């Protein structure tokens, strides 16, 4: 028993949402994600490549409107958000593949 | 004797907004006076009202009501706005009266 590495019970993923609203907060945060494959899977290499295409942004990227990332460009051209990031968080048997952005209350919809 | 009180408490239950967990003042039609009063409510009272109302709209869409235990009881209904509203109206009538003179 002592030298056997325990296998954890699998965690079920659920398409769903949680909305914590506080209009008193200056900017909104939003994160969206689908279930990832988990450490072992090779596809993670492709997912990471994919995340690189979309990439990330933040109001201090000097590249501005000429950034290669389309989402970054639009973000700049339309002042869509303060920042955004893609991610591929892995775990043993699962993971989260998504993105998170910070935007002003009135640009959330266009950003999304 | 306690007739007026028997009637009120009766109407209160007949109305039934207490089944949605709403306070009498939660059910007021928001005309101008009521809108001004609401702007004067302290933050906590305003957020409590907002949750109560949102909660009622959700029950309403679901076609459910709160469990009998959670119903607002006649004597525990807090007339949180009536005070502000009466003041708002007092001010209005003062100005109206004054602008005629």
């Amino acid at each position: 028993k002592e030298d056997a590495v325990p296998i954890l019970p699998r965690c079920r993923f659920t398409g769903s949402e949680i909305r914590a609203r506080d209009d008193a907060l200056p900017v909104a945060h939003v994160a969206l994600a689908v279930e990832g494959p988990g450490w072992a899977d090779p596809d993670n290499v492709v997912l990471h490549v994919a995340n690189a295409i979309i990439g990330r942004y933040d109001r201090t990227f000097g590249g501005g409107k000429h950034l290669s990332s389309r989402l970054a460009a639009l973000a700049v051209e339309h002042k869509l958000c303060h920042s955004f990031q893609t991610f591929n968080t892995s775990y043993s048997d699962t993971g989260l593949f998504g993105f998170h952005f910070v935007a002003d209350p009135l640009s959330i919809d266009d950003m999304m | 004797g306690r007739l007026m009180d028997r009637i009120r408490k009766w109407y209160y239950n007949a109305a039934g907004f207490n089944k949605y967990g709403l306070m009498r003042d939660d059910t007021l039609y928001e005309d101008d006076d009521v809108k001004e009063a609401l702007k004067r409510l302290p933050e906590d009272l305003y957020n409590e009202r907002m949750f109560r109302i949102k909660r009622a709209l959700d029950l309403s869409l679901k076609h459910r009501i709160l469990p009998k235990e959670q119903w607002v009881k006649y004597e525990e209904d807090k007339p949180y706005l009536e005070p502000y509203l009466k003041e708002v109206i007092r001010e209005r009538l003062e100005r109206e009266a004054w602008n005629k003179k």
Binding site: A20 | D44, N47, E48, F51, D58, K62
Partner: protein, 48 residues
């Protein structure tokens, strides 16, 4: 008075079946979409 009599009823039959089928189908779809709001749960969490 009404030569269409037979065709009218044959049509009525078709209208009913399709009506029964289509109505059920649409009922499910309305329900499906609304399920999101129907089962939705909320809570009031003030810094209290």
């Amino acid at each position: 008075a009404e030569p269409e009599h037979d065709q009218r009823k044959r049509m009525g039959l078709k209208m009913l079946l399709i009506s029964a089928l289509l109505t059920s189908l649409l009922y499910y779809m309305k329900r499906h979409k609304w399920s999101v709001l129907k089962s939705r749960k909320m809570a009031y969490r003030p810094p209290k």
